[PDB]
Design a protein around this ligand. Sequence first.
Ligand code: MKZ
Ligand code: GDP
Ligand code: MG
Length: 169
Amino acid sequence: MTEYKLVVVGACGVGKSALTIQLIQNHFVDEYDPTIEDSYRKQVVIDGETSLLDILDTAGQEEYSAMRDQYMRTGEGFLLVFAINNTKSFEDIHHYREQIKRVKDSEDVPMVLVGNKSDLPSRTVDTKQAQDLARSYGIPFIETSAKTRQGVDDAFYTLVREIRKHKEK
Ligand SMILES: CCC(=O)N1CCN(c2ncnc3cc(-c4c(C)ccc5[nH]ncc45)c(Cl)cc23)CC1
Ligand SMILES: Nc1nc2c(ncn2[C@@H]2O[C@H](COP(=O)(O)OP(=O)(O)O)[C@@H](O)[C@H]2O)c(=O)[nH]1
Ligand SMILES: [Mg+2]
């Protein structure tokens, strides 16, 4: 069966765990321990293809090692998550993109920029700013809400379609 190794990255509190649980369980979590990093498998049909998604929700303390780089290198596609009400989380996207570039030795890694918490009225990051960054990286931008499920399937399925496009190259 076709397996896709997806990794959800971004700053603390942006909704990585909530997005992962909404995708896997169809449930919104108000609290998910920030020390729990784990991977979840889900079978899905995307464009007629039965796909096994293995989703790693990154967490814990910021720490680095050769072993951690070897592990992150196995990810096939990355969701770069920020929260639309947190400018710092948007500025932090650069760090996550550079760490993926560093470990993959490539400027062509499947990724999708995700602007989460789109249900909140307290926006500080304009959609145009996020589209401009995504255009600079050459990747799609998807607005999501783990709370209402807006854009969740689209964010993960678009990443899978980007991995397929990359594998065809
Ligand atoms: C609130 C707790 C929480 O959600 N955290 C989010 C993940 N954390 C990280 N913080 C800072 N930079 C990080 C950098 C990386 C990383 C990436 C994206 C790619 C290759 C890599 N090689 N080595 C590290 C690395 C990852 Cl996976 C996590 C980071 C802790 C806080
Ligand atoms: N309103 C709203 N809250 C969200 C959303 N996604 C996550 N949250 C909340 O934001 C907090 C941090 O979410 P979490 O998934 O733990 O973030 P993580 O540290 O990136 O894993 C939690 O209280 C979540 O319930 C969202 O789309 N909208
Ligand atoms: Mg988390």
